[PDB]
Write an enzyme that holds these catalytic residues in place. Structure first.
Site, PDB file in Angstrom:
ATOM      1  N   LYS A  79       1.975  11.867  -3.734  1.00  0.00           N
ATOM      2  CA  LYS A  79       0.921  11.106  -4.392  1.00  0.00           C
ATOM      3  C   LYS A  79      -0.135  12.011  -5.000  1.00  0.00           C
ATOM      4  O   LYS A  79      -0.723  11.662  -6.021  1.00  0.00           O
ATOM      5  CB  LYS A  79       0.284  10.136  -3.385  1.00  0.00           C
ATOM      6  CG  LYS A  79      -0.578   9.022  -4.013  1.00  0.00           C
ATOM      7  CD  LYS A  79      -0.859   7.904  -3.032  1.00  0.00           C
ATOM      8  CE  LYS A  79      -2.081   7.147  -3.491  1.00  0.00           C
ATOM      9  NZ  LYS A  79      -2.484   5.952  -2.628  1.00  0.00           N
ATOM     10  N   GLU A 137      -6.620   0.053  -4.933  1.00  0.00           N
ATOM     11  CA  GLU A 137      -6.764  -0.006  -3.467  1.00  0.00           C
ATOM     12  C   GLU A 137      -8.077  -0.649  -2.973  1.00  0.00           C
ATOM     13  O   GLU A 137      -8.044  -1.462  -2.096  1.00  0.00           O
ATOM     14  CB  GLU A 137      -6.571   1.397  -2.805  1.00  0.00           C
ATOM     15  CG  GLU A 137      -5.127   1.860  -2.856  1.00  0.00           C
ATOM     16  CD  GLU A 137      -4.927   3.372  -2.740  1.00  0.00           C
ATOM     17  OE1 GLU A 137      -5.807   4.126  -2.226  1.00  0.00           O
ATOM     18  OE2 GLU A 137      -3.835   3.816  -3.135  1.00  0.00           O
ATOM     19  N   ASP A 194       0.878  -1.185   0.000  1.00  0.00           N
ATOM     20  CA  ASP A 194       0.000   0.000   0.000  1.00  0.00           C
ATOM     21  C   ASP A 194       0.929   1.253   0.000  1.00  0.00           C
ATOM     22  O   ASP A 194       1.678   1.492   0.976  1.00  0.00           O
ATOM     23  CB  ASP A 194      -0.923  -0.070   1.220  1.00  0.00           C
ATOM     24  CG  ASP A 194      -1.895   1.127   1.323  1.00  0.00           C
ATOM     25  OD1 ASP A 194      -1.948   2.012   0.439  1.00  0.00           O
ATOM     26  OD2 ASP A 194      -2.594   1.207   2.337  1.00  0.00           O
ATOM     27  N   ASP A 199     -13.234   4.437   2.380  1.00  0.00           N
ATOM     28  CA  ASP A 199     -11.796   4.539   2.696  1.00  0.00           C
ATOM     29  C   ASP A 199     -11.464   5.960   3.194  1.00  0.00           C
ATOM     30  O   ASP A 199     -11.277   6.902   2.424  1.00  0.00           O
ATOM     31  CB  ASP A 199     -10.978   4.070   1.466  1.00  0.00           C
ATOM     32  CG  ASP A 199      -9.466   4.338   1.567  1.00  0.00           C
ATOM     33  OD1 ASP A 199      -8.942   4.839   2.591  1.00  0.00           O
ATOM     34  OD2 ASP A 199      -8.772   4.017   0.581  1.00  0.00           O
TER      35      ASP A 199
END
Length: 382
Positions: free
Chosen positions: A71, A176, A9, A199
């Site tokens: 990211k 993910e 991850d 999430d």
């Protein structure tokens, strides 16, 4: 050949690495004893490069040369309106270089360097790789790496590239929320199911409608909020105490960042405590001008301070359902991911939204994505 492949991850705020060992996924702890590692890179005046907890831990004394949220920028061009927005809020320099947003830091002693966003993520990925290799007692060459479902071709390629910099052959890029589902064994189950993944990370909120049919996943709809997470819940709690302090003393903590940061550290731990306990004590010795901080946060207070933020998570869930032509009843599986989903009140809200229906349970929501990534890494040797 591929050796022991690892499952990574690669998160906006925290990263996690797992491996399949002895018939089981093992989530691996880092040199600091943590099963999650901050996606931070700091360069010190003396010229040391810090990655993970040590980068995160110093940072208050180094805002210009401490790098996070790469990211947000990876796979994007300089002139992407998203990038142009984000860099307003980042405390490090970003410049245009080769059409891309490059990070510029002082590497030590005034020496200036630029890094592509995938260079910074490669440093993080190198940290994950060392974490894994120390556990395994051997070198690792191959990886499964996860990305958000909404990641496009360039963002996927740039993540692969970050892996290649890190000495990693990224054999599979997985979404993910699919990885999360895999961790729970939902890809095994027979017949067609609709899966809602919720999430709530440290800085981003992602909701995904997945479809499983014969172990093949399709992402139908994604929503969420790019700038909502647990850190936003920390901030609320600081503002409450800084306000209570600017009332009990007349002093203003914000004149001193070191004071403000020390509050931040203690709030974080209180927040984590309140998931298990009903009160938490926030105690800072020598907090502002030699004077001490003692105050105690209740769970009821934490919640009130955050209730509107907690409630705003439901609106992406409604939009996702609408965009995929489904209703609440159509959801066969609810998967919670992200450290914030351990907040008792967020669990209540999700359950009540879905009319008393329980989510999948049993895997640390911080670890679920790397877990699933390790499930697939596992199959890729054997």
């Amino acid at each position: 050949d591929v050796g022991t492949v690892v499952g990574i991850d690669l998160g906006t705020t925290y990263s996690c690495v797992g491996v399949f060992k002895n018939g089981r996924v093992e989530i691996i702890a880092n040199d600091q004893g943590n099963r999650i590692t901050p996606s931070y890179v700091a360069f010190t005046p003396e010229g040391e490069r810090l990655i993970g907890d040590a980068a995160k831990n110093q940072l208050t004394s180094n805002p210009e040369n401490t790098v996070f949220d790469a990211k947000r920028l990876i796979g994007r061009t300089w002139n992407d309106p998203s990038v142009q927005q984000d860099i307003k809020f980042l405390p490090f320099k970003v410049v245009e270089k080769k059409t891309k947003p490059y990070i510029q830091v002082d590497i030590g002693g005034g020496q200036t360097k630029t890094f592509a966003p995938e260079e910074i993520s490669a440093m993080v990925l190198t940290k994950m790789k060392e974490t894994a290799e120390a556990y395994l007692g051997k070198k690792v060459t191959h990886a499964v790496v996860t990305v958000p479902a909404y990641f496009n071709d360039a963002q996927r390629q740039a993540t692969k590239d970050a892996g290649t910099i890190a000495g990693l052959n990224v054999m599979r890029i997985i979404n993910e929320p699919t990885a999360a589902a895999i961790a729970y064994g939902l890809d095994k189950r027979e017949g067609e199911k609709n899966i809602l993944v919720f999430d709530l990370g440290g800085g981003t909120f992602d909701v995904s409608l997945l479809t499983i049919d014969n172990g093949v996943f399709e992402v139908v709809a994604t929503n969420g909020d790019t700038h909502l997470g647990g850190e936003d819940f920390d901030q609320r709690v600081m503002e409450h105490f800084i306000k209570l302090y600017k009332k009990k003393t007349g002093k203003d903590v914000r004149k001193d960042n070191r004071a403000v940061q020390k509050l931040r550290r203690e709030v974080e731990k209180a927040k984590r405590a309140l998931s298990s306990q009903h009160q938490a004590r926030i105690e800072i010795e020598s907090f502002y001008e030699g004077e001490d901080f003692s105050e105690t946060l209740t769970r009821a207070k934490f919640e009130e301070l955050n209730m509107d933020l907690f409630r705003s998570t439901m609106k992406p869930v409604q939009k996702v359902l609408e965009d995929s032509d489904l209703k609440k009843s159509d959801i066969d599986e609810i998967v919670l991911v992200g450290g914030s989903t351990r907040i008792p009140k967020i669990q209540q809200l999700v359950k009540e939204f879905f009319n008393g229906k329980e989510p999948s349970r049993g895997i640390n929501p911080d670890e679920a994505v790397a877990y699933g990534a390790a499930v697939q890494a596992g199959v890729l040797s054997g």
